[PDB]
Amino acid sequence: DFEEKMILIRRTARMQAGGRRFRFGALVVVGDRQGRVGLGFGKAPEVPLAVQKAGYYARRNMVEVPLQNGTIPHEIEVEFGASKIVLKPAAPGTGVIAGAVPRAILELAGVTDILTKELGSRNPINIAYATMEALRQLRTKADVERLRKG
Amino acid sequence: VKELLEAGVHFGHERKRWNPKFARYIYAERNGIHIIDLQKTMEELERTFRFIEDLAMRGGTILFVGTKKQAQDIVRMEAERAGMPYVNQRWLGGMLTNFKTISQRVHRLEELEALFASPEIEERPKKEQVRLKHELERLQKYLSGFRLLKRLPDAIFVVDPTKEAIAVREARKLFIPVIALADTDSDPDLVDYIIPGNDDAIRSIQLILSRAVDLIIQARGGVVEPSPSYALVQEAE
Amino acid sequence: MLTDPIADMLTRIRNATRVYKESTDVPASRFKEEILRILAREGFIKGYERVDVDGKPYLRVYLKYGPRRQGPDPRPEQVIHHIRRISKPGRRVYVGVKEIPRVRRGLGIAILSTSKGVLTDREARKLGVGGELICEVW
Amino acid sequence: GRYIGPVCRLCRREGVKLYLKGERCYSPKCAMERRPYPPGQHGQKRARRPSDYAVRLREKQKLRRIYGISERQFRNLFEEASKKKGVTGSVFLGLLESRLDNVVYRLGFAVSRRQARQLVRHGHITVNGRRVDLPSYRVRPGDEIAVAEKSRNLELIRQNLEAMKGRKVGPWLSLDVEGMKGKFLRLPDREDLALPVQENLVIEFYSR
RNA sequence: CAGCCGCGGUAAUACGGAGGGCGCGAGCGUUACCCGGAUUCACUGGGCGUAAAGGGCGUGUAGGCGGCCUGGGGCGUCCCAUGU
RNA sequence: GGGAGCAAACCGGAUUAGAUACCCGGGUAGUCCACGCCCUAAACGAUGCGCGCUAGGUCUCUGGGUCUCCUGGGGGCCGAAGCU
Ligand SMILES: [K+]
Ligand SMILES: [K+]
Ligand SMILES: [K+]
Ligand SMILES: [Mg+2]
Ligand SMILES: [Mg+2]
Ligand SMILES: [Mg+2]
Ligand SMILES: [Mg+2]
Ligand SMILES: [Mg+2]
Ligand SMILES: [Mg+2]
Ligand SMILES: [Mg+2]
Ligand SMILES: [Mg+2]
Ligand SMILES: [Mg+2]
Ligand SMILES: [Mg+2]
Ligand SMILES: [Mg+2]
Ligand SMILES: [Mg+2]
Ligand SMILES: [Mg+2]
Ligand SMILES: [Mg+2]
Ligand SMILES: [Mg+2]
Ligand SMILES: [Mg+2]
Ligand SMILES: [Mg+2]
Ligand SMILES: [Mg+2]
Ligand SMILES: [Mg+2]
Ligand SMILES: [Mg+2]
Ligand SMILES: [Mg+2]
Ligand SMILES: [Mg+2]
Ligand SMILES: [Mg+2]
Ligand SMILES: [Mg+2]
Ligand SMILES: [Mg+2]
């Protein structure tokens, strides 16, 4: 079935009469590896309990990625916050040339060969979040054809 | 079935507090009030009823919504008339959206309902036997139409899409479609199958809605035997 | 005054679609026509007609969109996802044939004007001539 | 030079069966039998979850450790591969496996990866007639990889060509056993190959 | 000790030692220096309401920039041939 | 030149540990005017000028028309799309 993969996990701190009130957050991808990917952000009192939750949110925000042989139809740039993500598609043997976040989203898309740049805020949450609405955006010689048709 | 020339009940509502998106469904503005072009209404009615029809005979269920006390009862009634949930008092913090749990209400309605009647009714103190009669009493108020609801509903039928829009907003986050009796004061866009004309004014809520029920029952398994709701039109006048 | 008509058309179009108008007047040039024309070929508008809007020539441009949507925000997909002017008054831009770019690793166009006329890239390419890059439309 | 140390202890490092020492890293003794856990004071103890790096790195050190080669030597044939046409990943392996100190381990002659080394080095092998004492020699396709009738008559040769009666040869070789020859037929292929390795991940380590 | 972050006031994985471990290997490490990362000078490719950033306003000179149709010329621009 | 009221500086009076200050009673320059200089600023919308485009609702100033509506010009609130 699915692979769970989890980018980051953090510690957000609250303030209170008498002192700190901690809490946790989790970033999760879920892949099939075949055009289906999931992004989860999972907060709650207990780390585990977080990833857990993340997971679940993951599988509900599903993105259906038109692959095409280890790689993408056509380049995109995408702009979430001032996280900017650059995706450009490559010949097999290329590799998953990204960093950190945007990798294990494509890795888990079942993408195999593609080129990425990040520009702007490095922040993962958004860099992931971008990467998504990046994918969410792609289209196919097919898909396009269909729009313009007369 | 279907009706014609209902200018004598409804035509259009609301002054110049419109929404320009609605714009198209307007005919012209008479004395600052807006006046819907029913003729278009008719086209949609079909396109729409066509949509009820099928989901009716599929087995499937509508959800009716008026928290408007301008039409609070017509709903209860026309929705009792089709074995189809209604919501009436007020819509609720995610009835569909948080359903799982808005449902855990109906659960501890039954639990309380038939824990009256007779058995062991009074094996417990009394500072707490008129407190429970209260928790239940309350569940009774708004959950009453939300009772026959067991899964998510396969439609939503609204009166004021603007007055309940926390209903509409909800539907879609879940992919459920939206029928509504939307008028000028509201956003056409976010309704899937639209009934142009009066958010307001019993006269028309009745006519329209009730017909919708004509249509749910008719095919499914029944016949056309005038509804006991024309009798709460004669109670405004 | 205008500064770039072309710009302005394109924009007027970028602007129109983005809120789902049916059809916008731009005021008319021959050039302007020739461009619109190509959008047709490639299906980016549904077409245009010459009209006279108070006695001064224009070009109603009947834009076109995808199908009503499913879920929150039933707002069509754009057909014209992107339109960007390229040559600009006081920044001109020229490609010769080996240079003509490839739009969305293939999915849209450039419009060039050549000594052989307003073409797409695949148009000018085949035809084997370069020129001024006007814009860039996927 | 090359490594020269506890090998059937890297058998152990990567955590995966590594063939280096022959009969023994074969016959319930290469420890992945007896203690699959990694060498050193912290062996049984649970490890925290490999860093995105670590992996990328291991998988390479694996591939290298495998063929008994130095990273300096290793990379050079990488660089070559990426520069070369067609799926880079493969050709790396392509070329790796085109190594003579391999072409010979492949072709039986000696048990082990390090043996075909010190067997090439000490002279006992030929290619097309000429002798070659260089492990690093890039065997093409056409090459008759031979024993030298000079050492030929040797204990360690007989033994090991005699164990090679009956057994089978990778598609891309013909171990003839009569004249102790052996051909090398066409460049092997990711598919043709054995390897306990994610070549696609080795690439990924050098995109650094 | 220390590249940065920051490590030592008697449980220091960060000081010194030892065992072991990782990387490389006739080398390996420090320094210095150049590109890179750095879309941090942004042509590709950045900004200026509160983060650094609209000139106190205006007039106006150089300069930059220019609405719609036709015609001539071919400086820009484009193509082919060719030399280098 | 002018100098009514104000009021830096300054004289006294309180006040506080001190009070070279907020409080008080006085008081010169200045503040006013002519003519010449100075060119500064939270000179602020802290937002450069222009032209085109892209839902609305409401309140206001001033204009035209077939006048509790329409159309033009300016100040102001909310708010579509969108931006951030
Ligand atoms: K910047
Ligand atoms: K000027
Ligand atoms: K005083
Ligand atoms: Mg930005
Ligand atoms: Mg930054
Ligand atoms: Mg990152
Ligand atoms: Mg290659
Ligand atoms: Mg040290
Ligand atoms: Mg200690
Ligand atoms: Mg310490
Ligand atoms: Mg250290
Ligand atoms: Mg130490
Ligand atoms: Mg740079
Ligand atoms: Mg500032
Ligand atoms: Mg200013
Ligand atoms: Mg300033
Ligand atoms: Mg001038
Ligand atoms: Mg011009
Ligand atoms: Mg001319
Ligand atoms: Mg001419
Ligand atoms: Mg010329
Ligand atoms: Mg004086
Ligand atoms: Mg005084
Ligand atoms: Mg005093
Ligand atoms: Mg008047
Ligand atoms: Mg105004
Ligand atoms: Mg206004
Ligand atoms: Mg908004």
From Swiss-Prot, chain A:
Keyword Ribosomal protein listed? yes
Record-level GO cellular component terms: small ribosomal subunit
Q: Where are the transmembrane segments?
A: none
- Segment forming the signal sequence: none
Q: State the superkingdom.
A: Bacteria
UniProt-listed HAMAP family:
Ribosomal_uS5_B
Subunit relationships: Part of the 30S ribosomal subunit. Contacts proteins S4 and S8.
Family, as annotated: Belongs to the universal ribosomal protein uS5 family.
**Name of the protein:** Small ribosomal subunit protein uS5
Please tell me the species this chain comes from. Answer: Thermus thermophilus
Swiss-Prot record, chain B:
**Signal peptide region:** none
Biological processes, Gene Ontology terms: translation
Q: Which domain of life is it from?
A: Bacteria
Instruction: Please give the PROSITE patterns that the UniProt record associates with this protein.
Output: RIBOSOMAL_S2_1
Which keywords describe this protein according to UniProt? Coiled coil, Ribonucleoprotein, Ribosomal protein, RNA-binding, rRNA-binding
Could you give a GO molecular-function term held by this entry? rRNA binding
Family listed: Belongs to the universal ribosomal protein uS2 family.
User: What does the record note on quaternary structure?
Assistant: Part of the 30S ribosomal subunit. Contacts protein S8 and may contact the N-terminus of Era.
Q: What is this protein called?
A: Small ribosomal subunit protein uS2
What is the protein's species of origin? Thermus thermophilus (strain ATCC 27634 / DSM 579 / HB8)
Classification from the root reads: Bacteria, Thermotogati, Deinococcota, Deinococci, Thermales
Swiss-Prot record, chain C:
Q: Which UniProt keywords apply?
A: Ribonucleoprotein, Ribosomal protein, RNA-binding, rRNA-binding
The superkingdom listed in its UniProt entry is Bacteria
What GO cellular component is one of the record's annotations? Answer: ribosome
Q: Name one Pfam family in it.
A: Ribosomal_S8
GO biological process terms, semicolon-separated? translation
Molecular function, one GO term: structural constituent of ribosome
Instruction: Say if the entry is tagged with keyword Heme.
Output: no
Is this entry keyworded Nucleotide-binding?
A: no
Could you describe the subunit structure of this protein? Answer: Part of the 30S ribosomal subunit. Contacts proteins S5 and S12.
State the function annotated in the UniProt record.
One of the primary rRNA binding proteins, it binds directly to 16S rRNA central domain where it helps coordinate assembly of the platform of the 30S subunit.
- Which family does the record assign? Belongs to the universal ribosomal protein uS8 family.
Name the UniProt record assigns to this protein: Small ribosomal subunit protein uS8
Q: Which species is the source of this protein?
A: Thermus thermophilus
Q: Which gene encodes it?
A: rpsH
From Swiss-Prot, chain D:
GO annotations of cellular component type? small ribosomal subunit
> S4 RNA-binding domain spans which residues?
98-160
Give the record's cofactor note, including how many are bound: Binds 1 zinc ion per subunit. In a number of structures (e.g. 4Y4O, 5FDV) a 4Fe-4S cluster is seen in place of the zinc cofactor.
What biological process terms from GO does the record include?
Answer: ribosomal small subunit biogenesis; translation
Q: Which residues bind Zn(2+)?
A: 8, 11, 25, 30
Alphabetical list of PROSITE patterns matching this protein: RIBOSOMAL_S4 (PS00632), S4 (PS50889)
Q: Per its database record, what is this protein's job?
A: One of the primary rRNA binding proteins, it binds directly to 16S rRNA where it helps nucleate assembly of the body and platform of the 30S subunit. Binds mRNA in the 70S ribosome, positioning it for translation.
What name does the UniProt record give this protein?
A: Small ribosomal subunit protein uS4
Its lineage reads: Bacteria, Thermotogati, Deinococcota, Deinococci, Thermales
Gene name in the database record: rpsD
